[PDB]
Write a protein that binds this ligand. Structure first.
Ligand SMILES: Nc1ncnc2c1ncn2[C@@H]1O[C@H](COP(=O)(O)OP(=O)(O)OP(=O)(O)O)[C@@H](O)[C@H]1O
Ligand SMILES: Nc1ncnc2c1ncn2[C@@H]1O[C@H](COP(=O)(O)OP(=O)(O)OP(=O)(O)O)[C@@H](O)[C@H]1O
Ligand SMILES: Nc1ncnc2c1ncn2[C@@H]1O[C@H](COP(=O)(O)OP(=O)(O)O)[C@@H](O)[C@H]1O
Lengths: 478, 501, 11, 179, 480, 72
């Protein structure tokens, strides 16, 4: 028998549970509460213990909807942390926050479970190999290369291109990358969690007949759940990738979208747990909340976790505490502007506010780092001149200054690249471009063998010959 | 509404209340929050005394409230159980220290975390110790070879200074600190790098570049990951200072790098909020300034009576979107001897390292340089500020004078000779010969891109030709006239050698 | 100093 | 109900449960309530500008004049030295509450024009014993000429549960008239 | 005195102490804890009671650290405020807030002493003497004259030249003084206080071979101290200076750096003494506290006090409530800027925002006042012209306007002098400029007879003669 | 000064008297105005008076408002 007690309070998703005196639940123990429905017995409401309030009482955030919870109902303590199933059962399946299938298929294995609050691998167990991970987008390939095994952060406002970008990264990568990729949907639309599923199923990644060989797991903390569920789906996806990386030794991909909702979940529940508000709205335990996810997403000598994630910066503010504390636990940031979105150069990646820790001449060689450095130099020169340009114009400049303004006006357009996903929006079909040809295109731009042809020629193309053939083509239709 | 009345304590006190007894030896657990525990009992405990829980997790009795004690946790309190007993360790937060820590990665608990073995240390030192007063100090009068020509000419850091390395995201701060540590491989300073709240991959990357560049005989890497609680992160720089402070008491010159200090500041903000202390500007406590002061004032040069073992701090602070008006940047600026501000806009514009020489301050000045560099770098930073301010205005012009335009050219040559590549240290002999070739107008006759490509070949030329220059600059530290004649011949013959090219 | 510098840029 | 007072009342009920002196302490706090019903003595002990030694002395004279066990008095000592004296009336209302709760003497109220006998009280006593689990069921009666036909019975932790058999039918009718 | 008070609560630097109901200390009394340190010996941790709380518990403030103080310690009332030694014994000795000699010398003669907390002089005992005194720094001499016996603020940010200016001002004024000087360090770098101590040991004003012939008394409450020491070192130093002016009746000096650390210490301890927070985080008792401190610093009919105090400004915002409060209690204010700091012009005194009360026709002479208001005029003209000539260009101004631009660009450089203490930072021997030389230089620059000199010739030169000789040097080198 | 009254309460005073002093000046001017005689009054400054009153409020735990000034 496990010790059972009664709830004394309920304040929305925050549940205050008293117990018999000698026997108390630990920290992070889950409380399966019986509850009451209109029909039958719901029981699906479930609480995890955050605090011990004294007088043999704990406070516990509810993971599911808090209605049904009448004060004075029986609460059973399981004795363990919240523990989700993992292994071969989750593959090709859409999971819930508590590790329960929500894709309306057969019951998964309830046998090979693991608790979600497992600690991070020790500092001895780290690997120190730095390899570039090319994806085929010009702005990540030249400027800020992504790292095999390093966490990758995507930032941006509302509707500035984060989810089409992460879907295009999935499109290029997850076909050939012969490892499991656990997508995690934390705090975004269920429409996205459905369109992703239909694309996965129709493509053949999740084959219904023979669901075994699927090598993709899913979980979804969408925008219709209480703050506990959007606060714990991150750890659910994390242990569901952690088992693969630890035991099967597989290189694992992870795609979370978008962890700012996972931050806002804690910032919404900490105001209900009574804890004192920190900086402008968030919880005091903010960076520890960040680390308790991010530090467990490291690669080891046993395997690999590469974690693309969208980090929605709120109100188009980059220095808000949640993106500010997200910026530290990442191997590359690629911040998505609103000005480049409204001006149409899609993707709207801010070039010289995008940074990676892998742009170093020992990794990418001398030539690539040299070309990248000079590209960033000319882009910043145009960026410095932009105020003088916007107030008055271009004639007031020297010729040596308009050479850089013209080169950067060509670069700012050649930094676009049509997407294999966003072809259904613009109409320009998707182009995959290599790194070894992105460098040669940018070398041909910076040399001056292409500066004669106009600036809208470079707009929305792939390889450099697409831009030169675009210039040759738009001088035929007179 | 008030704690310490949980109806089991009330009967425990009502069973005997013809008494005035004290229960000093033990204490119970009433609350276990998110890393902070309220303790009933412990009727003798100091503020700061180490208190051990029933699980076996130590803590510090920070808030000594009226009837109950608000104890913070130096670990994760997952296995704490309320009503169970705590103790008193009697000692006030000591860590062992000795010369066997050298080269091993250590937790903030001062227990090694690279698994290379257990470390032995007899004499112990409290993690918090008072700063040396005015009698046990002296003026800062030794140089410190940072390796970067820009800082070593223009913002002279010396042995006993505490130069705040302030900057923004990914602008080269840790690179500056790591070059400073790695350069010292023949000067015998004891480097200490306390990495607070960094990504564990970055800690491993820094320790691997250290162990590959050979600095495993110097350093101690007092590094904890992000998954430490707020308390371990807040305590880590005091542990690093305890180690380096032990060493500088043993008349060894040291070098400590706090990286970062806004991370310790936000860790302290967590505990000031979870103990319900009042918040101030941007929800920081009022006393985070005093926290940084008590930590940062421990680094200075000891006097002739205490062995003269210096200790140098190099605290690192990032600024979001490049400001100073926020709380923690402003505090750490006001505490330190000067500040070095690294601008990301000079960083992306090729100027690497990106030291904004206008607003970067050196409060010790040329008494932290040898007589050679003190001679040739006399009025350098000020004349470079003048050249920058008049080049900003000469863009508001059409036609100028040839005298001022030549001045703009020579200032551009001085500006171009100071770009130092990463992992490329310059020695003081290289530095002073580069700066004498610079400030006297021996570069004003060549193109912009040729400056460094000429200077590195000239430096190697004097390396393989004139060791008498090295001996004059090194043994005697003074820029004599014989060395200047050597250098002038070297420049002239090198100019003929490139005129052949 | 942010509001003062912003007012002065307005001016 | 974990108030600042029901924790104290629950502590005293805990002491009287482990010591086996509950049914005595009920009339004890009846005496103490008829003490603290008067405003001058409750005002003497409540206001904080009267020195502590004389409070000690006068409560000791109350004990030696009314004959109480320290089982009762140590509560007042802890209260006065813990400055919870101004909550003594709340604690002494909650003491009998928790005492009835644990020892199972559940109180049942009725409010009507009733001129009743032992019969209706007894049958409602056993009926609420069956439906509410009353160990011992004790009644309370209020005479009220307002509600005409039936009664209005309340019970629970505070008397929360209700079923009135007098005017509820009236309100159902005047609500379903227009509906 | 002669009670036995027990500690009841220790929330960091604040303590709650309880007494027997017979005796209770008065506000601003001085407790003293007979506690114990780590080695078990009795160690005193002095305290000041700031508040009566009721229920015979009072609330204290620790003048030293709390690490080692246990709930159940004993304290003894002293029945007085914190008395600090005075006289001729407080000359040449480093002093803490506790009146103890911090430098490694013997004790102090404690037969004559004075309490910290007294009230400011009456309205009738204030000496309305408005005499000017020549400082030497060209800007401080001409543009912003300093009042003798009147308070003087050095408002500046971090690392602009407050401490350099106040040290060079000591180097200039103290040796040419006619009385005693006192130095109170309130929250500064400890190595910089020791730098001052060594530089004054070698500058003889300590003359440490024979004590009590020194002319400076040094008090230091610096940054490594709990908030009580920083909150009361200003009061200690002011009580010493008040003794030197009231009993000796001689002109004393009082260099207070840093006063913003005094206000910050007040706020740090004040958020925890129960008080609601005021504007952006300072204490509610801001203005009356700065009055209770500052208005004791005054000239009087016995001996005046000129108080050159360095006020820190956070984020370089003079709007901030501590500079907003501190501006009122100062006469001759000086604004140190960051623009002129990174511009190269040291000292970074903002010529337009620094303004004094002594620059008057009937107080500082006619030609000085006309030349000073004229210099401020042409600089205001240039700073108004700046955001036009930025985007317009330099070939689109008239001759009067371009002449104004060039003359202002000469003037701004000429107001930069290589200080005596800044030879480490400049690379030039120290300079001392007279008032006569400065007004001559500005007559010569303004009236037109030097518009053929280079606009780097006025950079870091003492006299206009040195500007002309530097001009010859520059042009000769350029012509070779 | 043959007619000018100058009430004054400097910064070293408590917040109480700084808050009071303009009302004493106003009562003097009210009296002299009610003697059928024209008057004048100079307040210098109302900012210090408001700071004194704001401190007197925040010490009495009156709820703070915009930039800590109470609602009065
Ligand atoms: N490459 C592109 N071409 C055209 N339009 C684009 C492109 N990228 C983004 N957009 C526009 O941006 C809109 C939203 O982008 P997306 O949904 O991918 O990111 P998001 O809304 O920021 O993600 P979320 O809000 O889920 O975090 C799309 O409707 C699309 O029209
Ligand atoms: N002088 C230099 N020349 C060329 N590259 C440099 C130079 N200095 C620094 N860098 C580059 O900058 C990169 C990032 O620097 P660094 O990580 O020190 O910045 P950071 O501020 O520590 O980053 P974070 O904001 O994550 O703390 C380094 O990998 C290095 O290659
Ligand atoms: N008159 C001056 N001449 C040269 N350098 C100066 C001068 N004033 C300030 N500085 C620079 O400022 C620094 C000292 O400033 P300081 O006054 O100590 O800062 P703060 O004003 O914050 O106390 C020195 O490093 C020096 O380089």
């Amino acid at each position: 028998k496990k010790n059972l007690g009664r709830i004394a309070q309920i304040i929305g998703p925050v549940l205050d549970v008293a117990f018999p005196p000698g026997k108390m639940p630990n920290i992070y123990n889950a409380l399966i509460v019986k509850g009451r429905d209109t029909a039958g017995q719901p029981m699906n409401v479930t609480c995890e213990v955050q605090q011990l309030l004294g007088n043999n009482r704990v406070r516990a955030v509810a993971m599911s909807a808090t209605d049904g919870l009448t004060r004075g109902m029986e609460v059973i303590d399981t004795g363990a942390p919240l523990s989700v199933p993992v292994g071969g059962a989750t593959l090709g399946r859409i999971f819930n926050v508590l590790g329960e299938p929500v894709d309306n298929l057969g019951p998964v294995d309830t046998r090979t479970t693991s608790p979600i609050h497992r600690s991070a691998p020790a500092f001895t167990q780290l690997d120190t190999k730095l390899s570039i991970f090319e994806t085929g987008i010009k702005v990540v390939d030249l400027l800020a290369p992504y790292r095999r095994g390093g966490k990758i952060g995507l930032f941006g406002g509302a509707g500035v291109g984060k989810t089409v970008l992460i879907m295009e990264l999935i499109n290029n990568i997850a076909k050939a990358h012969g490892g499991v990729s656990v997508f995690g949907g934390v705090g975004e639309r269920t429409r996205e969690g459905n369109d992703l599923y239909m694309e996965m199923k129709e493509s053949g990644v999740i084959n219904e007949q023979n669901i075994a060989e699927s090598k993709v797991a899913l979980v979804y903390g969408q925008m219709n759940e209480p703050p506990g569920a959007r606060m714990r789906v991150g750890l659910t996806a994390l242990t569901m990738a952690e088992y693969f990386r630890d035991v099967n030794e597989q290189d694992v991909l992870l795609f979370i979208d978008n962890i700012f909702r996972f931050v806002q979940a804690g910032s919404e529940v900490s105001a209900l747990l009574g804890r004192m508000p920190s900086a402008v709205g968030y919880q005091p335990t903010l960076s520890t909340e960040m680390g308790s996810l991010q530090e467990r997403i490291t690669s080891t000598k046993e395997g690999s976790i590469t974690s693309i994630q969208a980090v929605y910066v709120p109100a188009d503010d980059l220095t808000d505490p949640a993106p500010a504390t997200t910026f530290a636990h990442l191997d590359a940031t690629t911040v998505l502007s609103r000005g480049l979105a409204a001006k149409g150069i899609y993707p709207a990646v801010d070039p010289l506010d995008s940074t990676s820790t892998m742009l170093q001449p020992r990794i990418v060689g001398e030539e690539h780092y040299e070309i990248a450095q000079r590209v960033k130099e000319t882009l910043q020169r145009y960026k410095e001149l932009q105020d003088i340009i916007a107030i008055l114009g271009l004639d007031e400049l020297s010729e040596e200054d308009r050479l850089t303004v013209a080169r950067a006006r060509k670069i700012e357009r050649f930094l676009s690249q049509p997407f294999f996903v966003a072809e259904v929006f613009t109409g320009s079909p998707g182009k995959y471009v290599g790194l070894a040809e992105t460098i040669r295109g940018f070398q041909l731009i910076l040399s001056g063998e292409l500066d004669s042809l106009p600036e809208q020629a470079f707009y929305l193309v792939g390889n450099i010959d697409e831009a030169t053939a675009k210039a040759m083509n738009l001088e035929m239709e007179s | 509404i008030r704690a310490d009345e949980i109806s089991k304590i009330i009967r425990e006190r009502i069973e005997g209340y013809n008494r005035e007894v004290k229960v000093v030896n033990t204490g119970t657990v009433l609350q276990v929050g998110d890393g902070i525990a309220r303790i009933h009992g412990l009727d003798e405990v100091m503020a700061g005394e180490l208190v051990e829980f029933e699980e076996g997790t130590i803590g510090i009795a920070l808030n000594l409230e009226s009837n109950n004690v608000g104890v913070v946790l130096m670990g994760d309190g997952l296995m704490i159980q309320e009503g169970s007993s705590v103790k008193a360790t009697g000692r006030i937060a000591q860590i062992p220290v000795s010369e066997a820590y050298l080269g091993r990665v250590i937790n903030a608990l001062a227990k090694p975390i690279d698994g290379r073995g257990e470390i032995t240390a007899s004499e112990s030192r409290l993690i918090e110790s008072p700063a040396p007063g005015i009698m046990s100090r002296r003026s800062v009068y030794e140089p410190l070879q940072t390796g970067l020509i820009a800082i070593d000419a223009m913002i002279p850091v010396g042995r006993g200074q505490r130069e705040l390395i302030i900057g923004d995201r990914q602008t080269g701060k840790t690179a500056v600190a790591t070059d400073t540590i790695l350069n010292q491989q023949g000067q015998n300073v004891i480097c200490v790098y306390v990495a607070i709240g960094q990504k564990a991959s970055s800690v491993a990357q820094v320790v691997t570049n250290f162990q590959e560049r050979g600095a495993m005989e110097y350093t101690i890497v007092v590094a904890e990951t992000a998954d430490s609680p707020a308390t371990l992160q807040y305590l880590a720089p005091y542990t690093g200072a305890a180690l380096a402070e032990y060493f500088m008491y043993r008349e060894r010159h040291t070098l400590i790098i706090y990286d970062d200090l806004s991370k310790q500041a936000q860790a302290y903000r967590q505990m000031s909020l979870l103990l319900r202390r009042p918040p101030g500007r941007e929800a920081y406590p009022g006393d985070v300034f005093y926290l940084h002061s008590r930590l940062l004032e421990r680094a200075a040069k000891l006097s002739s009576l205490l062995g003269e073992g210096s200790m140098t701090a190099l605290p690192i602070v990032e600024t979001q979107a490049g400001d100073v008006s926020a709380y923690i940047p402003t505090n750490v600026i006001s505490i330190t001897d000067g500040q070095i501000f690294l601008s990301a806009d000079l960083f992306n514009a090729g100027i690497r390292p990106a030291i904004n020489v206008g607003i970067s301050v050196s409060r010790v000045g040329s008494a932290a340089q040898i007589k050679a560099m003190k001679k040739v770098a006399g009025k350098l930073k000020l004349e470079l500020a003048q050249f920058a301010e008049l080049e900003a205005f000469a863009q508001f012009a059409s036609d100028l004078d040839k005298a001022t335009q030549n001045q703009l050219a020579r200032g551009q040559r001085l500006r171009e000779l100071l770009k130092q590549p990463q992992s490329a240290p310059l020695t003081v002999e290289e530095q002073v010969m580069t700066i004498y070739t610079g400030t006297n107008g021996y570069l004003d006759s060549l193109e912009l891109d040729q400056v460094r490509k000429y200077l590195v070949e000239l430096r190697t030329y004097v390396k393989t030709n004139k060791p008498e220059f090295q001996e004059i600059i090194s043994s005697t530290k003074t820029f004599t006239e014989e060395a200047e004649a050597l250098l002038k011949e070297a420049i002239q013959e090198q100019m003929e050698r490139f005129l052949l090219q | 100093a942010n509001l003062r510098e912003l007012r002065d840029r307005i001016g | 109900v974990d108030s600042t007072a029901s924790r104290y009342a629950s502590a005293l009920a805990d002491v009287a449960d482990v010591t086996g002196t509950l049914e005595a302490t009920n009339s004890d706090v009846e005496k103490l309530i008829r003490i603290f019903s008067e405003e001058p003595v409750y005002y003497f002990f409540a206001n904080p500008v009267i020195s502590i030694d004389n409070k000690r002395s006068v409560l000791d004279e109350i004990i030696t004049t009314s004959g109480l066990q320290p089982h009762t008095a140590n509560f007042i000592n802890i209260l006065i030295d813990s400055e919870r004296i101004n909550l003594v009336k709340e604690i002494l209302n909650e003491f009998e509450d928790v005492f009835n709760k644990i020892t199972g003497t559940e109180v049942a109220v009725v409010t009507s024009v009733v001129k009743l006998e032992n019969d209706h009280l007894a049958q409602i006593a056993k009926g609420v014993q069956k439906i509410t689990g009353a160990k011992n069921v004790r009644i309370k009666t209020v005479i009220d000429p307002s509600l005409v036909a039936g009664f209005t019975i309340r019970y629970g932790n505070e008397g929360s549960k209700l079923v009135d058999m007098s005017v509820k039918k009236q309100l159902e009718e005047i609500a379903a008239q227009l509906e």
